[PDB]
Design an enzyme around this catalytic site. Structure first.
Site, PDB file in Angstrom:
ATOM      1  CD  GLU A  13      21.861   5.481  -6.966  1.00 28.60           C
ATOM      2  OE1 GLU A  13      22.895   6.008  -6.498  1.00 28.60           O
ATOM      3  OE2 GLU A  13      20.882   5.147  -6.264  1.00 28.60           O
ATOM      4  CG  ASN A  16      11.694   6.162  -3.568  1.00 27.99           C
ATOM      5  OD1 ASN A  16      10.744   6.919  -3.756  1.00 27.99           O
ATOM      6  ND2 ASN A  16      11.552   4.868  -3.360  1.00 27.99           N
ATOM      7  CD1 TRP A 242      10.954  -2.349  10.357  1.00 18.70           C
ATOM      8  CD2 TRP A 242       9.783  -4.137   9.664  1.00 18.70           C
ATOM      9  NE1 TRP A 242      11.294  -3.409  11.156  1.00 18.70           N
ATOM     10  CE2 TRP A 242      10.583  -4.515  10.761  1.00 18.70           C
ATOM     11  CE3 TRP A 242       8.943  -5.084   9.068  1.00 18.70           C
ATOM     12  CZ2 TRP A 242      10.594  -5.815  11.245  1.00 18.70           C
ATOM     13  CZ3 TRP A 242       8.948  -6.374   9.556  1.00 18.70           C
ATOM     14  CH2 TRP A 242       9.766  -6.729  10.628  1.00 18.70           C
ATOM     15  CG  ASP A 316       3.787  -0.067   0.080  1.00 17.58           C
ATOM     16  OD1 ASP A 316       2.597  -0.441   0.260  1.00 17.58           O
ATOM     17  OD2 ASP A 316       4.739  -0.846  -0.090  1.00 17.58           O
ATOM     18  CB  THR A 333      15.897   7.418  -1.275  1.00 18.69           C
ATOM     19  OG1 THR A 333      15.823   6.070  -1.749  1.00 18.69           O
ATOM     20  CG2 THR A 333      17.327   7.927  -1.238  1.00 18.69           C
ATOM     21  CG  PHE A 334      10.283   3.700   0.357  1.00 18.16           C
ATOM     22  CD1 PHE A 334       9.386   3.866   1.409  1.00 18.16           C
ATOM     23  CD2 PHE A 334       9.892   2.932  -0.732  1.00 18.16           C
ATOM     24  CE1 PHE A 334       8.126   3.277   1.360  1.00 18.16           C
ATOM     25  CE2 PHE A 334       8.622   2.372  -0.790  1.00 18.16           C
ATOM     26  CZ  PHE A 334       7.740   2.553   0.254  1.00 18.16           C
TER      27      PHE A 334
END
Ligand SMILES: *[C@@H]1O[C@H](CO)[C@@H](O)[C@H](O)[C@H]1NC(C)=O
Ligand SMILES: *[C@@H]1O[C@H](CO)[C@@H](O)[C@H](O)[C@H]1NC(C)=O
Lengths: 409, 421
Positions: A13, A16, A242, A316, A333-334
């Site tokens: 996993e 995030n 992205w 980020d 998830t990010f």
């Protein structure tokens, strides 16, 4: 009467998803303490961000004082300073598939690779890479349920002598009351390290001409004093997450497709700065830059000398979360964590819940607006997991669940 | 016939003894490559952790486990660390995978979109720079990366490697090498590859001192002298072994089967006692990772005239070295009995074949308490109607078995699905 909950997550996993699992387990501890049990959550050390690349404190990523306002937390190494072995490991596993339940059962694969009995009351395991850590006991438990179900499991009489219990495969449990008050309290508590915030804030103010005063994104130090608002403006930049690799193995834009989207958004919003969060290789980024009109400028945090990869990811995400407008990647998830960050900052929902469309589907499915909280069916929840077997749920039977099957970890 | 280097790796979560089998597949690929005029040398992948429940440490040399001079007699080999000292880039990674279609069965290969989980394992950072695990070394990268769907054996992989797409590459790394099967399973070249895998002399010396001290055993009295150069080994079934029963005792069932395939502790005591009476042996060499209380229980259940021995002088040897010592000690027993479908057991059976024991003393498996006439392993004899099915190509996930027949459908294949890795 101090009790310690430790946990871990499936090795494959990502960062995030693990952040989401924290909230599941925090709410279990919150319920435990609301029912009179003096439980402390032991924060599992962070490992490698990329599987193609150990034992890092949470204080590198998150502000522990903020986490502590929701539940009591300690670092694993603080737990070790109590020189008490781990009494019990419970390795959660799935039932072969709307019914909450658990039971001790025979170990499904791959539990027996992960823990090994060497003496009557000594079980070895990874234990976050720490040599000399062992458990007195080990078993598998099939579970289908949420933080409440896990509360019940932990109060089972078989463990009443245990003051330290470690729950492995914690991603197996779902959220109780997905998208509601306690979910959002847990999430709001996950303030980023002040050192990371300062680094990000220096980058915002220098390169993106952005600061909390002019952006109207001032947050109080104490997250429990946060009030609802939709008045955040953000900095004069478009935030884009992205993703180029498709971890679902159709759903992502091409490089030209992305240039078009960015150009249209920049014109429509009068923005000339783009903050690009990506791990795309340098030649794909250069391609994207070359395809953008000359007056648009792309920025990336790249002064990363000491910073590990999780710290960079958070920077980020914090930079994306302070954009005037954010657009993210399908099912990422990010992205979802950024959306939550923007909800907390208090941005209009229209600037937040936006997803990059693939070249063939210009009006693609856009993400559900899970709004911060202080019938027809609800939206399906996000998957409990990003690889292997998980579940989504829907509420308003007043609750429903379905399998979500992802690629192998 | 410029020098070329073959590197490989294996699915994480595959174990030591399956990796030893994969070595032989890849060694035979190199042997075919060299027989077809291609000057390939095999780069030995560093060993990781023996146990998935143990702290990963520094990547380990083959010379800790195996005699490199013996391996070199089949094909040319070099250690990875020595390959690095040549400052030769890695030109190409080929990540093997199954055909997304699946599947009668045909040997074939084709470049294809990457199936899970290839994208997690390799990451392009620049045009000609791919990061990956590369055995835990930080500064190592590949200039190129792709996935190839493949169904076949060492021969198929030889063909893949000679494809023109790679003719400018001096150094090719083949990941997911366990995806290929053996060509001519159980025949001459299979056995040459296996015979080449002589253990480190330091491990052999340690084991031999143990044999002599505890087990009343040595190569002269046991008739288990092997020549130093394995290529001079001749067939013989003259080995008698030491005056002890060798048992490989697995407690965890890595097949997670519905019905028990392993005996209980009392079940094991009965088996050992019965065999010791039938064979008139009083010494047992026990190879197990069972926890100490299960071993003590087993000892307590055995008649007082039986003595159980274990190598326990472990505190300057890593776990792989101990496992090899265990295997060598079992392989020198008068009689061996092992655990169902265990690759550790299979390597012992192969060891005994090389030493030259009668097959009756070798191909024996411990029965579970409810099936005293349980299925016994196929006697794959050393070589210098349909066959049995081969052993599975893997110990976890998706693999295959094959069956073969000669002349005067030569070959067939079936999926074998194991627990996840
Ligand atoms: C508790 O122990 C009993 C006795 O083995 C077992 O049947 C039961 O399933 C266990 N329950 C849990 C949740 O450990
Ligand atoms: C050789 O290269 C071309 C380039 O894309 C590719 O289409 C073809 O499949 C390759 N063959 C193999 C087996 O690598």
């Amino acid at each position: 009467e101090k009790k310690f909950l430790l946990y871990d997550v499936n090795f494959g996993e990502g960062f995030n998803l693990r952040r989401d699992v924290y909230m599941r387990v925090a709410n279990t501890v919150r319920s435990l303490r609301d029912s009179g049990e003096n439980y402390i959550l032991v924060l599992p050390p962070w490992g490698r961000l990329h599987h193609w690349k150990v034992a890092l404190s949470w204080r590198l990523f998150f502000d522990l004082e903020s986490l502590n306002r929701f539940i009591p937390v300690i670092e694993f190494e603080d737990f070790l300073d109590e020189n008490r072995p781990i009494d019990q490991v419970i390795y959660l596993q799935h039932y072969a598939e709307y019914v909450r339940k658990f039971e001790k059962r025979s170990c499904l694969p791959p539990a027996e690779s992960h823990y090994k009995q060497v003496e009557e009351f000594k079980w070895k395991g990874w234990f976050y890479s720490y040599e000399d850590v062992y458990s007195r006991n080990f078993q598998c438990v099939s579970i289908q349920g949420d933080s409440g179900t896990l509360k019940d499991l932990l109060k089972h009489s078989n463990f009443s002598e245990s003051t330290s219990i470690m729950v492995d495969r914690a991603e197996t449990i779902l959220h109780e009351h997905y998208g509601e008050v306690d979910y959002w309290k847990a999430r709001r508590s996950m303030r980023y390290s002040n050192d990371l915030v300062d680094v990000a804030d220096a980058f915002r103010k220098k390169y993106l001409d952005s600061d909390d005063k002019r952006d109207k994104t001032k947050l109080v130090d104490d997250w429990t004093k946060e009030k609802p608002r939709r008045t955040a403006i953000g900095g004069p930049y478009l935030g884009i997450h992205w993703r180029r690799r498709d971890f679902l193995y159709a759903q992502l834009p091409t490089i030209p497709g992305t240039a078009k989207i960015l150009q249209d958004l920049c014109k429509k919003l009068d923005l000339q700065k783009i903050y690009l969060a990506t791990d795309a290789p340098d030649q794909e980024v250069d391609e994207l830059k070359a395809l953008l009109n000359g007056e648009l400028e792309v920025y990336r945090f790249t002064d990363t000398q000491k910073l590990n990869d999780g710290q960079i990811a958070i920077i980020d995400q914090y930079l994306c979360a302070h954009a005037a407008y954010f657009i993210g990647s399908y099912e990422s998830t990010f992205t979802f964590r950024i959306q939550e960050d923007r909800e907390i900052i208090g941005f209009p929902i229209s600037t937040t819940f936006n997803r990059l469309c693939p070249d063939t589907e210009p009006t693609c499915e856009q993400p559900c607006k899970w709004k911060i909280v202080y019938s027809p069916w609800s939206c399906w929840s996000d998957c409990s997991v990003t690889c292997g077997k998980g579940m989504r749920t829907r509420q308003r039977d007043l609750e429903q669940a379905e399998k979500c099957m992802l690629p192998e970890c």
